[PDB]
Amino acid sequence: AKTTQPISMDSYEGQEVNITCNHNDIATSDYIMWYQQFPNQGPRFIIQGYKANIANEVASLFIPTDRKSSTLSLPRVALSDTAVYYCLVGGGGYVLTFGRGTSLIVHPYIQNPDPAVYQLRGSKSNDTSVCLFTDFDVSQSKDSDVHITDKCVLDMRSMDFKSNGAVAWSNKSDFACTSAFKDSVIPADTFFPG
Amino acid sequence: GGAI
Amino acid sequence: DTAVSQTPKYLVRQTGKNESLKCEQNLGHNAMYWYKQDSKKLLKIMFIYNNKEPILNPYRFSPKSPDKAHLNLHIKSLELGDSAVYFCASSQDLGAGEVYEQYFGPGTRLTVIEDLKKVFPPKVAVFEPSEAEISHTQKATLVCLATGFYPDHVELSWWVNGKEVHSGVCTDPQPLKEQPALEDSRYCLSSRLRVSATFWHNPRNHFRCQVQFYGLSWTEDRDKPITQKISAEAWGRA
Amino acid sequence: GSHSLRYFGTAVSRPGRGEPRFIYVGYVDDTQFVRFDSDAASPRTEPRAPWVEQEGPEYWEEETRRAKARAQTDRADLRTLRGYYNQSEAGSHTLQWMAGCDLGPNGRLLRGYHQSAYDGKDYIALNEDLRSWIAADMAAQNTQRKWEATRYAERFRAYLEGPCLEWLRRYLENGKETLQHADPPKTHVTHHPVSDHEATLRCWALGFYPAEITLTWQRDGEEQTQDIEFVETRPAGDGTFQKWGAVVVPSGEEQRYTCHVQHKGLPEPLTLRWEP
Amino acid sequence: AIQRTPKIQVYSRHPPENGKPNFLNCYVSGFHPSDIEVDLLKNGEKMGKVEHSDLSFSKDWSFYLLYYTEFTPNEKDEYACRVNHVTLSGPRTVKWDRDM
Ligand SMILES: *C(=O)CCCCCCCCCCCCC
Ligand SMILES: [Ca+2]
């Protein structure tokens, strides 16, 4: 009834994702259930089963006869499939113990990278400097004085495809966008206008 | 579990 | 549409005060659940009701079930540990061998404070595209920063020519502590909007970043932080 | 070679006393192993056969949840049924339900059950295809619509092919030295003069398990289908069953009669005569 | 509300032998509704310490019950089962016949 699963998982858009859960003390009455959660939202049911394989419109689950592991498969993943996936087992069916879960991130496939770091124009009233790392295929700052969001994905409905991006900003004395994110592994071909 |  | 509905969506209150969380579902389900979700992100069951009866379980928390479609949470003597997102859920039935998926409400994000003096509305700024990337890409990226607010109860939205856009938009999933190691840190939130350059160089296209702040229901000279909207703007250039 | 796991519940409304009464029992084959009675200090599912007491506290605590949940269902059902049939809240009424699973000599689910009765009459039941319902009446056809809409049968099919069969397998293992060892009957014939022209032959089958048995009389190799008495098979009280069959015969012609006993604990059928 | 009339059987657990301890059973089956009254009798009197099986029922929904007590049979003593049900006009009594 206590489940174990990978902490994180990466995937490219369109591939099939397989998450593997472990329940070695599964009792006879226990079903296997998988829930999904977006940030800021109520968990959402995916699939449940007792044995063998189950399959519905959204995902599928395989259970070996030994019943002590299970594998959730997401068939052709969209970016709207980025979420935390919980594996639950038993409880008489209605008491749900959610665990840490697995954090699934689905990434866009990038035709041609064009890694560049741009500086942004803040209004004359504000003196905050804002740097935007963009169009690559990203780590935190060691400095308390610098803020960096983690990777975020952009989709332009009129446009053909998607784009990766990250934003850093600071009020530091001599903040240059030159080296704002280098606690991270920058591509050699990164464009730095200056 | 279902109710009539 | 049919779903589990929950009110309110955000709540900031003082310790010792009393409060009511209300949950409603029109799905025909008989079993209802309340879940607490602390900042270390684990869902802990609190109460299970079935056909107006306690099944599972302090009497600071006093669930009320006037009927089967409503399970309401009445909380007394608020303390700091009560801060979490409270999710309400329901099932067709409690199993008697077979099992039923649960449907979840949108949550109520509740923050309790020692005193209101820490509650601050956000400052919001817009950062126009760099003319450098318009060269290299023909696309234009605007960043919005909402900074220095508390609590983290904010919704950011983009408006173009008076109407709200979901296109070309990427907002941070959650606000982050400006200084994660301090107790009285405030939160920041970032977002970016990307259009093509032709859209941007037109001086009639009007961009507005809007943060909805949910605050207070105060002797100081600074005005108090009651629920409000704060926005920053830019017009097309070049 | 068939084994079965079954639950039976009786819900009886008691108007004038003010609260209803729920009695639930569970059988593996012809052996009762659990009971639940809601008229008790604080009702709990209790063991009624030794091969299930070895289960832990989280079994008993789970089966008690399951019983009380089902009692809540039967409580709503009794009132709802009064509605459907347009009755006063002044009579006493009865709900009966039964569910479970048969496991064949194939190792697979042979038949599954989910059925109810109201006031002694059938209400709704799962079809042997495990996909559809059989509703006796207008009122029941309500329930049928509701249950086909939420698609309850697939949910319940999943319980029968899953947790149900496996519990049956676990019970059969824990109780193998009583539940998988058939007891053959002990048999004898008795002779009791009725007159100086007639006499009674009574064939006895004693101390057997499981309860299914065939006991018949023959006169010169042919089976008697008239003029015979068979009491229905009955419990001894100790886990075994008894039955007898009796025939009235002409004096002196007793040796023309044979009793025939068939039972799973017999290597092959048994044929016996009155031994003077 | 269908009504079905109980079938009654009175018998001992083991074949009856004098002065040897036994159990006296009264088995009522096939009845409906479930409300029933069953007394074991010794020489016309209600026996004490009479236990019974849990209410259960058959495929045709009719109830069955076993009533039982320890007894030591002797030849001078007479035993019976007496049964009350809504389908009966006054209690029906079946005598113990040691050969049935
Ligand atoms: C849901 O109500 C399905 C109804 C059939 C399930 C059988 C109920 C099992 C109850 C077990 C109680 C244990 C006491 C013997
Ligand atoms: Ca009567």
Short mmCIF file of N, CA and C in Angstrom, two decimals, chain A residues 31-181:
data_model
loop_
_atom_site.label_atom_id
_atom_site.label_comp_id
_atom_site.label_asym_id
_atom_site.label_seq_id
_atom_site.Cartn_x
_atom_site.Cartn_y
_atom_site.Cartn_z
N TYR A 31 -6.54 -2.27 -5.04
CA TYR A 31 -6.48 -1.86 -6.42
C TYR A 31 -5.32 -0.91 -6.60
N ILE A 32 -4.92 -0.75 -7.85
CA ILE A 32 -3.88 0.17 -8.24
C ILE A 32 -4.48 1.36 -8.99
N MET A 33 -4.21 2.56 -8.49
CA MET A 33 -4.77 3.79 -9.04
C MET A 33 -3.72 4.84 -9.33
N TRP A 34 -3.92 5.55 -10.43
CA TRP A 34 -3.01 6.62 -10.79
C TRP A 34 -3.78 7.89 -10.90
N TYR A 35 -3.30 8.92 -10.20
CA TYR A 35 -3.86 10.25 -10.31
C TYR A 35 -2.85 11.24 -10.87
N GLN A 36 -3.38 12.31 -11.44
CA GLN A 36 -2.60 13.37 -12.07
C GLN A 36 -2.83 14.66 -11.29
N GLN A 37 -1.80 15.49 -11.11
CA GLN A 37 -2.06 16.83 -10.56
C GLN A 37 -1.28 17.95 -11.21
N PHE A 38 -2.02 18.97 -11.68
CA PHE A 38 -1.42 20.22 -12.16
C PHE A 38 -1.14 21.12 -10.99
N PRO A 39 -0.16 22.11 -11.23
CA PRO A 39 0.08 23.01 -10.09
C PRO A 39 -1.21 23.77 -9.81
N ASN A 40 -1.62 23.99 -8.56
CA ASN A 40 -2.81 24.83 -8.33
C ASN A 40 -4.16 24.17 -8.72
N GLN A 41 -4.28 22.84 -8.73
CA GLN A 41 -5.55 22.28 -9.24
C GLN A 41 -5.91 21.03 -8.46
N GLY A 42 -7.03 20.61 -8.53
CA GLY A 42 -7.39 19.37 -7.88
C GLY A 42 -6.84 18.17 -8.64
N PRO A 43 -6.36 17.14 -7.93
CA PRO A 43 -5.88 15.91 -8.57
C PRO A 43 -6.96 15.34 -9.49
N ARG A 44 -6.57 14.68 -10.58
CA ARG A 44 -7.54 14.13 -11.50
C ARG A 44 -7.25 12.67 -11.78
N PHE A 45 -8.28 11.86 -11.65
CA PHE A 45 -8.20 10.43 -11.89
C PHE A 45 -7.78 10.14 -13.32
N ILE A 46 -6.92 9.14 -13.47
CA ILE A 46 -6.39 8.66 -14.75
C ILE A 46 -6.90 7.25 -15.06
N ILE A 47 -6.58 6.32 -14.16
CA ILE A 47 -6.80 4.92 -14.43
C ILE A 47 -6.64 4.07 -13.15
N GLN A 48 -7.36 2.95 -13.11
CA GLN A 48 -7.32 2.05 -11.98
C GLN A 48 -7.52 0.62 -12.49
N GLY A 49 -6.98 -0.34 -11.75
CA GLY A 49 -7.11 -1.71 -12.16
C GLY A 49 -6.70 -2.65 -11.07
N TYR A 50 -6.96 -3.92 -11.26
CA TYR A 50 -6.56 -4.91 -10.30
C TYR A 50 -5.52 -5.82 -10.85
N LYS A 51 -5.69 -6.23 -12.08
CA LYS A 51 -4.77 -7.15 -12.66
C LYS A 51 -4.64 -6.99 -14.12
N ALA A 52 -3.58 -7.55 -14.65
CA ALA A 52 -3.30 -7.54 -16.07
C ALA A 52 -3.25 -6.17 -16.65
N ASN A 53 -3.97 -5.92 -17.72
CA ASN A 53 -3.92 -4.61 -18.29
C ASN A 53 -5.29 -4.04 -18.49
N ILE A 54 -5.37 -2.74 -18.27
CA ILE A 54 -6.54 -1.88 -18.35
C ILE A 54 -6.19 -0.78 -19.33
N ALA A 55 -7.18 -0.30 -20.09
CA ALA A 55 -6.92 0.77 -21.04
C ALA A 55 -8.17 1.57 -21.40
N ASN A 56 -8.05 2.88 -21.24
CA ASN A 56 -9.12 3.79 -21.54
C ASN A 56 -8.66 4.85 -22.50
N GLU A 57 -9.45 5.90 -22.59
CA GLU A 57 -9.26 6.93 -23.58
C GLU A 57 -8.00 7.78 -23.30
N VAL A 58 -7.57 7.89 -22.04
CA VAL A 58 -6.45 8.78 -21.68
C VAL A 58 -5.06 8.11 -21.46
N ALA A 59 -5.02 6.91 -20.90
CA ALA A 59 -3.74 6.24 -20.63
C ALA A 59 -3.91 4.73 -20.54
N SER A 60 -2.84 4.02 -20.18
CA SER A 60 -3.01 2.60 -19.89
C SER A 60 -2.06 2.10 -18.80
N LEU A 61 -2.47 1.03 -18.12
CA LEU A 61 -1.71 0.51 -17.00
C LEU A 61 -1.48 -1.01 -17.15
N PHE A 62 -0.25 -1.47 -16.92
CA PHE A 62 0.07 -2.90 -16.97
C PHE A 62 0.47 -3.43 -15.60
N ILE A 63 -0.15 -4.53 -15.20
CA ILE A 63 0.20 -5.13 -13.92
C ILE A 63 0.69 -6.56 -14.11
N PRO A 64 1.95 -6.81 -13.73
CA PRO A 64 2.46 -8.18 -13.77
C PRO A 64 1.63 -9.07 -12.84
N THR A 65 1.66 -10.39 -13.02
CA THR A 65 0.79 -11.26 -12.25
C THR A 65 1.19 -11.23 -10.77
N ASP A 66 2.46 -10.94 -10.53
CA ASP A 66 2.99 -10.86 -9.19
C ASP A 66 2.39 -9.64 -8.43
N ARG A 67 1.85 -8.69 -9.20
CA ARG A 67 1.15 -7.49 -8.70
C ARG A 67 1.95 -6.51 -7.82
N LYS A 68 3.27 -6.62 -7.77
CA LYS A 68 4.00 -5.76 -6.84
C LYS A 68 4.70 -4.58 -7.52
N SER A 69 4.51 -4.43 -8.82
CA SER A 69 4.94 -3.22 -9.51
C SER A 69 3.81 -2.91 -10.48
N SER A 70 3.76 -1.69 -10.99
CA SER A 70 2.84 -1.35 -12.06
C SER A 70 3.49 -0.30 -12.92
N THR A 71 2.98 -0.14 -14.13
CA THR A 71 3.58 0.77 -15.09
C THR A 71 2.50 1.57 -15.78
N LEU A 72 2.55 2.88 -15.60
CA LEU A 72 1.61 3.76 -16.26
C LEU A 72 2.18 4.25 -17.58
N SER A 73 1.40 4.11 -18.65
CA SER A 73 1.82 4.59 -19.96
C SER A 73 0.91 5.65 -20.53
N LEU A 74 1.54 6.73 -20.96
CA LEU A 74 0.92 7.86 -21.59
C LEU A 74 1.31 7.69 -23.03
N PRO A 75 0.34 7.53 -23.90
CA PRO A 75 0.63 7.20 -25.29
C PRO A 75 1.35 8.13 -26.23
N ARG A 76 0.94 9.37 -26.35
CA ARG A 76 1.54 10.32 -27.27
C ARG A 76 1.30 11.55 -26.50
N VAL A 77 2.35 12.02 -25.88
CA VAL A 77 2.24 13.09 -24.90
C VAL A 77 2.31 14.49 -25.50
N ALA A 78 1.44 15.36 -24.97
CA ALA A 78 1.39 16.77 -25.33
C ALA A 78 2.08 17.54 -24.22
N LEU A 79 2.33 18.83 -24.42
CA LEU A 79 2.85 19.66 -23.32
C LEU A 79 1.82 19.85 -22.20
N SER A 80 0.55 19.61 -22.51
CA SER A 80 -0.51 19.70 -21.52
C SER A 80 -0.51 18.45 -20.62
N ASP A 81 0.43 17.55 -20.90
CA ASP A 81 0.63 16.40 -20.05
C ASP A 81 1.72 16.62 -18.99
N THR A 82 2.29 17.82 -18.90
CA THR A 82 3.26 18.08 -17.83
C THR A 82 2.55 18.20 -16.48
N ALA A 83 2.85 17.28 -15.55
CA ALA A 83 2.16 17.24 -14.27
C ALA A 83 2.82 16.26 -13.33
N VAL A 84 2.36 16.24 -12.07
CA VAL A 84 2.83 15.24 -11.12
C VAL A 84 1.89 14.02 -11.16
N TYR A 85 2.47 12.82 -11.27
CA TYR A 85 1.72 11.57 -11.35
C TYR A 85 1.86 10.74 -10.08
N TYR A 86 0.72 10.48 -9.44
CA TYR A 86 0.73 9.70 -8.21
C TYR A 86 0.29 8.26 -8.47
N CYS A 87 0.99 7.33 -7.83
CA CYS A 87 0.63 5.93 -7.82
C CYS A 87 0.04 5.60 -6.45
N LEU A 88 -1.21 5.13 -6.42
CA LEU A 88 -1.85 4.80 -5.16
C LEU A 88 -2.25 3.34 -5.12
N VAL A 89 -2.21 2.74 -3.94
CA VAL A 89 -2.56 1.33 -3.78
C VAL A 89 -3.40 1.03 -2.52
N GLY A 90 -4.63 0.54 -2.73
CA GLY A 90 -5.47 0.03 -1.66
C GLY A 90 -6.25 1.03 -0.82
N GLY A 91 -6.21 0.84 0.50
CA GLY A 91 -6.92 1.68 1.44
C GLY A 91 -8.39 1.37 1.67
N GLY A 92 -8.85 0.21 1.21
CA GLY A 92 -10.26 -0.11 1.25
C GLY A 92 -10.96 0.58 0.08
N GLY A 93 -10.19 1.33 -0.69
CA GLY A 93 -10.68 1.95 -1.91
C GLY A 93 -10.97 3.44 -1.88
N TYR A 94 -11.33 3.97 -0.72
CA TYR A 94 -11.69 5.38 -0.62
C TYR A 94 -10.76 6.27 0.20
N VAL A 95 -9.95 5.69 1.07
CA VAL A 95 -8.92 6.47 1.74
C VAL A 95 -7.66 6.56 0.86
N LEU A 96 -7.34 7.74 0.35
CA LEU A 96 -6.23 7.88 -0.59
C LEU A 96 -4.98 8.43 0.06
N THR A 97 -3.94 7.62 0.11
CA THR A 97 -2.63 8.12 0.54
C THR A 97 -1.84 8.54 -0.70
N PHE A 98 -1.73 9.85 -0.91
CA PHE A 98 -0.90 10.34 -2.00
C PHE A 98 0.53 10.41 -1.52
N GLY A 99 1.47 10.04 -2.38
CA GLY A 99 2.87 10.15 -2.05
C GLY A 99 3.52 11.40 -2.60
N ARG A 100 4.84 11.35 -2.70
CA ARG A 100 5.60 12.39 -3.35
C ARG A 100 5.18 12.49 -4.80
N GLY A 101 5.00 11.34 -5.43
CA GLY A 101 4.65 11.29 -6.83
C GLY A 101 5.88 11.44 -7.71
N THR A 102 5.67 11.31 -9.02
CA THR A 102 6.67 11.50 -10.06
C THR A 102 6.42 12.79 -10.81
N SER A 103 7.43 13.62 -10.98
CA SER A 103 7.21 14.85 -11.72
C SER A 103 7.56 14.64 -13.19
N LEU A 104 6.55 14.60 -14.04
CA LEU A 104 6.77 14.43 -15.47
C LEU A 104 6.86 15.77 -16.18
N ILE A 105 7.98 15.99 -16.86
CA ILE A 105 8.11 17.16 -17.72
C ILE A 105 8.20 16.74 -19.18
N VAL A 106 7.27 17.20 -20.00
CA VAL A 106 7.36 16.94 -21.43
C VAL A 106 7.95 18.17 -22.13
N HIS A 107 8.96 17.94 -22.95
CA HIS A 107 9.72 19.02 -23.57
C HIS A 107 9.37 19.15 -25.04
N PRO A 108 9.44 20.37 -25.56
CA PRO A 108 9.23 20.52 -27.00
C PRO A 108 10.46 20.01 -27.75
N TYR A 109 10.26 19.49 -28.95
CA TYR A 109 11.39 19.17 -29.80
C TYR A 109 11.72 20.43 -30.58
N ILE A 110 13.00 20.80 -30.58
CA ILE A 110 13.45 22.04 -31.19
C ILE A 110 14.18 21.82 -32.51
N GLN A 111 13.56 22.23 -33.61
CA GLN A 111 14.12 22.02 -34.93
C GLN A 111 15.55 22.49 -35.04
N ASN A 112 15.73 23.78 -34.83
CA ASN A 112 17.05 24.37 -34.88
C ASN A 112 17.18 25.27 -33.67
N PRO A 113 18.19 25.02 -32.83
CA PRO A 113 18.37 25.89 -31.68
C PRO A 113 18.95 27.20 -32.14
N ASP A 114 18.59 28.28 -31.47
CA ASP A 114 19.15 29.59 -31.76
C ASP A 114 19.33 30.27 -30.41
N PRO A 115 20.20 29.70 -29.57
CA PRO A 115 20.36 30.16 -28.19
C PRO A 115 20.89 31.59 -28.15
N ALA A 116 20.16 32.47 -27.48
CA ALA A 116 20.55 33.87 -27.35
C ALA A 116 20.11 34.42 -26.01
N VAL A 117 20.89 35.34 -25.48
CA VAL A 117 20.55 35.97 -24.22
C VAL A 117 20.34 37.47 -24.46
N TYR A 118 19.09 37.91 -24.33
CA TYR A 118 18.73 39.30 -24.59
C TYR A 118 18.55 40.13 -23.31
N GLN A 119 18.80 41.44 -23.42
CA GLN A 119 18.55 42.36 -22.31
C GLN A 119 17.22 43.03 -22.57
N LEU A 120 16.43 43.29 -21.53
CA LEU A 120 15.15 43.94 -21.77
C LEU A 120 15.05 45.36 -21.24
N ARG A 121 14.26 46.13 -21.95
CA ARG A 121 14.05 47.52 -21.67
C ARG A 121 12.97 47.75 -20.66
N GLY A 122 13.37 48.19 -19.48
CA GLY A 122 12.44 48.52 -18.44
C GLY A 122 12.15 49.99 -18.57
N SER A 123 10.97 50.39 -18.10
CA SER A 123 10.57 51.80 -18.14
C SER A 123 11.49 52.65 -17.26
N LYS A 124 11.72 53.89 -17.67
CA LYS A 124 12.60 54.81 -16.93
C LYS A 124 12.41 54.85 -15.41
N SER A 125 11.21 54.59 -14.92
CA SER A 125 10.96 54.53 -13.48
C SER A 125 11.63 53.36 -12.76
N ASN A 126 11.75 52.22 -13.44
CA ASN A 126 12.35 51.03 -12.86
C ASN A 126 13.74 50.74 -13.29
N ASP A 127 14.54 50.32 -12.33
CA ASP A 127 15.94 50.07 -12.55
C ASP A 127 16.31 48.62 -12.41
N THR A 128 15.33 47.75 -12.55
CA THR A 128 15.50 46.31 -12.48
C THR A 128 15.98 45.85 -13.84
N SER A 129 17.01 45.02 -13.88
CA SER A 129 17.49 44.57 -15.17
C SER A 129 16.91 43.18 -15.39
N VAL A 130 16.45 42.91 -16.61
CA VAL A 130 15.79 41.66 -16.94
C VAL A 130 16.46 40.99 -18.13
N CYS A 131 16.90 39.74 -17.94
CA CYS A 131 17.55 38.99 -19.00
C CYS A 131 16.74 37.78 -19.41
N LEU A 132 16.72 37.53 -20.71
CA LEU A 132 15.87 36.50 -21.24
C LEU A 132 16.67 35.52 -22.09
N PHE A 133 16.87 34.33 -21.55
CA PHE A 133 17.51 33.24 -22.27
C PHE A 133 16.44 32.54 -23.08
N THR A 134 16.66 32.35 -24.38
CA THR A 134 15.56 31.87 -25.24
C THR A 134 16.01 31.07 -26.47
N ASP A 135 15.08 30.27 -26.99
CA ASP A 135 15.20 29.50 -28.23
C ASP A 135 16.25 28.39 -28.21
N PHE A 136 16.56 27.88 -27.02
CA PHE A 136 17.39 26.69 -26.84
C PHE A 136 16.52 25.43 -26.76
N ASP A 137 17.16 24.27 -26.63
CA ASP A 137 16.47 22.99 -26.47
C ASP A 137 16.38 22.58 -24.99
N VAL A 138 18.43 24.31 -17.29
CA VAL A 138 18.60 25.64 -16.75
C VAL A 138 18.56 25.49 -15.27
N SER A 139 19.58 26.01 -14.62
CA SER A 139 19.81 25.90 -13.19
C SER A 139 19.56 27.19 -12.41
N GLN A 140 19.51 27.05 -11.09
CA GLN A 140 19.38 28.19 -10.18
C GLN A 140 20.66 29.02 -10.02
N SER A 141 20.47 30.22 -9.48
CA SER A 141 21.55 31.15 -9.21
C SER A 141 22.05 30.93 -7.80
N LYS A 142 23.35 31.01 -7.59
CA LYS A 142 23.88 30.81 -6.25
C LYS A 142 23.65 32.08 -5.45
N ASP A 143 23.47 33.19 -6.15
CA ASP A 143 23.32 34.48 -5.49
C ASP A 143 21.89 34.82 -5.05
N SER A 144 21.77 35.24 -3.79
CA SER A 144 20.52 35.69 -3.20
C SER A 144 19.96 36.91 -3.94
N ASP A 145 20.84 37.61 -4.66
CA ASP A 145 20.50 38.89 -5.25
C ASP A 145 19.94 38.72 -6.65
N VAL A 146 20.06 37.52 -7.19
CA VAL A 146 19.58 37.23 -8.54
C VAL A 146 18.45 36.20 -8.53
N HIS A 147 17.43 36.44 -9.34
CA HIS A 147 16.27 35.56 -9.43
C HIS A 147 16.20 34.95 -10.83
N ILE A 148 16.11 33.63 -10.92
CA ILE A 148 15.98 33.00 -12.23
C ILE A 148 14.81 32.02 -12.21
N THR A 149 13.85 32.21 -13.10
CA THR A 149 12.79 31.24 -13.22
C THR A 149 13.35 30.01 -13.90
N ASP A 150 12.76 28.85 -13.67
CA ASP A 150 13.21 27.66 -14.40
C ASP A 150 12.52 27.66 -15.75
N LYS A 151 12.93 26.73 -16.60
CA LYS A 151 12.46 26.65 -17.98
C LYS A 151 10.94 26.69 -18.11
N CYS A 152 10.47 27.51 -19.03
CA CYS A 152 9.04 27.66 -19.25
C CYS A 152 8.78 27.54 -20.77
N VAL A 153 7.68 26.91 -21.20
CA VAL A 153 7.44 26.70 -22.64
C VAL A 153 6.31 27.54 -23.27
N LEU A 154 6.64 28.18 -24.39
CA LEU A 154 5.78 29.12 -25.12
C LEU A 154 5.15 28.55 -26.41
N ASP A 155 3.84 28.67 -26.58
CA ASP A 155 3.22 28.23 -27.84
C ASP A 155 2.38 29.36 -28.49
N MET A 156 2.77 29.71 -29.71
CA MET A 156 2.19 30.79 -30.52
C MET A 156 1.14 30.23 -31.51
N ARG A 157 -0.17 30.35 -31.25
CA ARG A 157 -1.18 29.67 -32.08
C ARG A 157 -1.09 29.97 -33.55
N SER A 158 -0.83 31.22 -33.88
CA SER A 158 -0.62 31.59 -35.25
C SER A 158 0.65 30.91 -35.79
N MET A 159 1.69 30.83 -34.97
CA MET A 159 2.95 30.24 -35.41
C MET A 159 3.06 28.71 -35.47
N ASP A 160 3.98 28.22 -36.30
CA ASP A 160 4.13 26.78 -36.54
C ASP A 160 4.53 25.90 -35.35
N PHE A 161 5.48 26.39 -34.57
CA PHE A 161 5.99 25.68 -33.41
C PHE A 161 6.29 26.45 -32.11
N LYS A 162 6.70 25.67 -31.11
CA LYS A 162 6.98 26.07 -29.72
C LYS A 162 8.43 26.46 -29.41
N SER A 163 8.64 27.07 -28.25
CA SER A 163 9.91 27.69 -27.87
C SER A 163 10.19 27.58 -26.35
N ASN A 164 11.43 27.25 -25.99
CA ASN A 164 11.85 27.20 -24.59
C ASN A 164 12.28 28.60 -24.17
N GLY A 165 12.18 28.91 -22.89
CA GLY A 165 12.59 30.21 -22.41
C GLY A 165 12.77 30.28 -20.92
N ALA A 166 13.60 31.22 -20.49
CA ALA A 166 13.87 31.41 -19.08
C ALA A 166 14.11 32.90 -18.84
N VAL A 167 13.75 33.37 -17.65
CA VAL A 167 13.89 34.77 -17.34
C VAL A 167 14.69 34.96 -16.06
N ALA A 168 15.68 35.84 -16.11
CA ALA A 168 16.45 36.21 -14.93
C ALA A 168 16.32 37.73 -14.73
N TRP A 169 16.29 38.17 -13.48
CA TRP A 169 16.26 39.60 -13.22
C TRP A 169 16.91 39.92 -11.89
N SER A 170 17.55 41.09 -11.82
CA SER A 170 18.23 41.50 -10.59
C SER A 170 18.27 43.02 -10.41
N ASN A 171 18.58 43.43 -9.19
CA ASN A 171 18.79 44.84 -8.87
C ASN A 171 20.23 45.10 -8.40
N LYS A 172 21.08 44.08 -8.57
CA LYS A 172 22.51 44.08 -8.22
C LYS A 172 23.28 45.29 -8.78
N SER A 173 24.28 45.72 -8.02
CA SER A 173 25.12 46.86 -8.37
C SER A 173 25.65 46.87 -9.81
N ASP A 174 26.26 45.79 -10.27
CA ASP A 174 26.80 45.80 -11.62
C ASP A 174 26.29 44.65 -12.43
N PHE A 175 24.99 44.46 -12.42
CA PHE A 175 24.41 43.32 -13.12
C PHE A 175 24.46 43.36 -14.64
N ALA A 176 25.27 42.48 -15.20
CA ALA A 176 25.37 42.30 -16.63
C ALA A 176 24.72 40.98 -17.01
N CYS A 177 23.97 41.05 -18.11
CA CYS A 177 23.28 39.91 -18.70
C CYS A 177 24.27 38.98 -19.36
N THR A 178 25.50 39.43 -19.37
CA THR A 178 26.61 38.74 -19.94
C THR A 178 26.76 37.41 -19.30
N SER A 179 26.72 37.41 -17.98
CA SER A 179 26.86 36.18 -17.26
C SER A 179 25.83 36.11 -16.18
N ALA A 180 24.57 36.02 -16.56
CA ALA A 180 23.53 35.97 -15.58
C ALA A 180 23.22 34.55 -15.20
N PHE A 181 23.19 33.68 -16.19
CA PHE A 181 22.88 32.28 -15.97
C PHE A 181 24.03 31.30 -15.98
#
